C-alpha cells in the first residue's frame, strides 16, 4: 500500500547513513590533519599543548589530539 512512512523512512535513513559516513570521514580527516600539522607533544610549560617542531616552538591549546 502507499506506506508514506516507509517510503519517507527509507529516504531518511539513506541520507542519514550516507551523511554519517561523510561525517566520520570528516572527523577522521581532521584528527589526521592535526596530527600531521602538529606531529609532536609539549613540555612542562606547554603541558598539554600541541606542537609543530621538536621543541615547543609556538605550540597551541586549540588543536588537541589523542
Amino acid at each position: 500500500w502507499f506506506s508514506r512512512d516507509l517510503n519517507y523512512g527509507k529516504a531518511n535513513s539513506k541520507i542519514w547513513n550516507a551523511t554519517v559516513a561523510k561525517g566520520l570521514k570528516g572527523i577522521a580527516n581532521e584528527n589526521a590533519e592535526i596530527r600531521k600539522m602538529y606531529p609532536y607533544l609539549g613540555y612542562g610549560d606547554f603541558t598539554g599543548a600541541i606542537c609543530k617542531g621538536p621543541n615547543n616552538q609556538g605550540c597551541t591549546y586549540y588543536a588537541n589530539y589523542t
Partner: protein, 436 residues
C-alpha cells in the same frame, strides 16, 4: 574486641554479598572526561517587554552547546506581604521552544506551577519560591529580581544540551507571552493597581564551550536526542454542586509515549488556586477572623495540603472503552501517586497518574503510547459542594465525598501529558522524528 570480630564472623550466608567480590566501596576511580567550560551569556529580547506583551529571543551562537536557561524579571510589589503568589512564575504566561522553525515544546505558567507542585521538593522547592515570589514578608513598593528557570528537556540535563554547533543553518528561539496581569504586582483580584511598574526582563542562556576533538565530532556527525515534550489540553470543569456529584468524561487528544499525566482544577481568576476558599487559617483572605472572605484567597498562602478543599472525588483513565485501572479517590492521585513515583509532597487540587516507574527522571521507565490509542479518556467524579466555607466546623468536620460551596469557583481544568520524542539534528538542520 572491635570491628575485626565482625569481619571474621563470615560464612555461607555471606557468599551472596561478598564471595568472589567484584567491587569495593573504598577505591573510587573517577571517570576521565572531556574538557569544557560554561558561560552565562545574556540574550537580547526581541519584541517589547511589559504586562500582556509578547517577546521572543534568539539564542546566539557564542558557545557550542546550550543547557540551562533562566529568565530574569524585575517586579515591584503592588501591595503588602500576602498579596502575591509566585508572581514571576505567573508573569511568564508561557514559553515556546522553536528549533529551525518547528515547535518542539511549550510550557505555561500553570504548567510551571503544576510541575513544581509535583516534582520539586524540600529546600529545592523553597529556593525556587525564593526566586519567583516574595517570601520574607516584603512590603508594598519592594523591588525584587526574580529568576525563572526554564524546564525544557535541555534545561534539565546537560545530556540533552542543544548542539547549536550542529545546527549551523537553524536558529533556536524562545517565544514568550507575558501575563496581562500579575497578582499583587499590577492587579489585586480584578482591580488594577495604580502606579504599578512594568517589568524589566532578561533571558540568560548558559553556554558550553567544548574542546576541539569533541567540537569536531559534534559539528560533523548527526545526532539524535531523546527529549521530553509537554502536551496540553484546556477544558471546562464539570462544575460540582451542593445538590450533586458532577461527572465528566474528557477525551484527551494526546499522543506519543507518555511518561505521565497530570492535572488540576482551578479558579483561573487566581493564579495557582487549585482548591476552594474557606474561613480556616490560610484558606482565604482574612481567614480565621471577622473580615474573612471566602471569595478571595490568601494569595501568599494560595496553595494548601488540605484535601477537604479539593474537588475531585475520584478518577480513572479509560483506554479505547476499557478501564486502564480501577477508579481511585482524588487523594490517591494527590498523595499516593507522588509518594510511590516522586518522593515529594503534592498540594491539594493537583493530581498525578504515572505510567512510569520513576516519572521524575530522564531515563524512560514505562510509557503509555497515546499515538496508538484512538480514545484516551479521563473520567472524573467531583465532590458535592455543600459545605459552608465560612464555618470551620463545617469545613473541617466533614466527610470524604464533600467539599466547600466555594469549590464551584474552580471551573477550569488543565490536563497535561509529558512524553518522549526524538529530536534529530544533521548537517546544520533539525527537527522532530514524530509528528504526533
Amino acid at each position: 574486641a572491635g570491628g575485626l570480630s565482625q569481619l571474621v564472623a563470615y560464612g555461607a550466608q555471606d557468599v551472596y554479598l561478598t564471595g568472589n567480590p567484584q567491587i569495593t566501596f573504598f577505591k573510587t576511580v573517577y571517570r576521565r572526561y572531556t574538557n569544557f567550560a560554561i558561560e552565562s551569556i545574556q540574550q537580547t529580547i526581541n519584541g517589547s517587554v511589559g504586562f500582556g506583551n509578547k517577546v521572543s529571543t534568539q539564542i546566539s551562537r557564542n558557545g557550542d552547546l546550550i543547557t540551562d536557561i533562566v529568565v530574569e524579571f524585575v517586579l515591584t510589589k503592588g501591595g503588602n506581604g500576602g498579596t502575591t503568589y509566585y508572581p514571576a512564575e505567573e508573569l511568564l504566561q508561557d514559553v515556546e521552544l522553536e528549533i529551525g522553525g518547528q515547535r518542539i515544546d511549550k510550557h505555561y505558567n500553570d504548567w510551571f506551577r503544576t510541575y513544581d507542585a509535583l516534582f520539586r521538593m524540600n529546600d529545592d522547592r523553597y529556593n525556587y519560591r525564593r526566586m519567583t515570589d516574595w517570601v520574607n514578608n516584603e512590603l508594598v513598593g519592594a523591588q525584587k529580581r526574580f529568576y525563572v528557570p526554564l524546564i525544557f528537556f535541555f534545561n534539565q540535563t546537560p545530556g540533552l544540551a542543544l548542539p547549536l554547533i550542529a545546527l549551523q543553518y537553524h536558529e533556536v528561539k524562545l517565544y514568550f507571552t507575558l501575563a496581562s496581569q500579575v497578582q499583587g504586582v499590577n492587579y489585586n483580584g480584578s482591580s488594577a493597581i495604580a502606579g504599578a511598574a512594568q517589568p524589566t526582563m532578561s533571558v540568560w542562556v548558559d553556554y558550553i564551550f567544548l574542546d576541539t576533538q569533541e567540537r569536531t565530532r559534534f559539528a560533523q556527525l548527526p545526532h539524535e536526542y531523546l527529549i521530553e515534550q509537554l502536551q496540553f489540553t484546556g477544558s471546562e470543569t464539570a462544575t460540582p454542586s451542593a445538590t450533586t456529584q458532577a461527572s465528566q468524561n474528557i477525551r484527551l487528544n494526546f499522543n506519543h509515549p507518555t511518561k505521565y499525566l497530570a492535572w488540576n482544577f482551578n479558579n483561573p481568576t487566581n493564579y495557582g488556586q487549585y482548591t476552594a476558599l474557606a474561613n480556616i487559617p490560610g484558606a482565604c483572605s482574612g481567614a480565621g477572623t471577622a473580615a474573612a472572605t471566602v471569595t478571595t484567597p490568601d494569595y501568599g498562602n494560595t496553595g494548601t495540603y488540605n484535601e477537604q478543599l479539593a474537588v475531585l472525588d475520584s478518577a480513572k483513565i479509560q483506554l479505547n472503552g476499557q478501564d486502564r485501572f480501577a477508579t481511585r479517590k482524588g487523594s490517591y492521585f494527590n498523595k499516593v501517586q507522588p509518594y510511590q513515583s516522586i518522593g515529594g509532597v503534592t498540594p491539594a487540587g493537583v493530581y498525578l497518574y504515572s505510567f512510569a516507574l520513576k516519572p521524575a527522571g530522564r531515563q524512560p521507565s514505562g510509557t503509555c503510547n497515546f499515538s496508538r490509542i484512538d480514545n484516551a479518556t479521563l473520567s472524573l467524579t467531583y465532590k458535592t459542594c455543600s459545605i459552608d466555607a465560612t464555618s470551620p466546623a463545617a469545613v473541617l468536620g466533614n466527610t470524604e465525598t464533600v467539599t466547600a460551596n466555594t469549590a464551584t469557583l474552580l471551573t477550569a481544568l488543565n490536563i497535561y501529558a509529558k512524553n518522549y520524542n526524538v529530536l534529530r539534528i544533521m548537517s546544520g538542520m533539525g527537527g522532530l522524528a514524530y509528528a504526533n
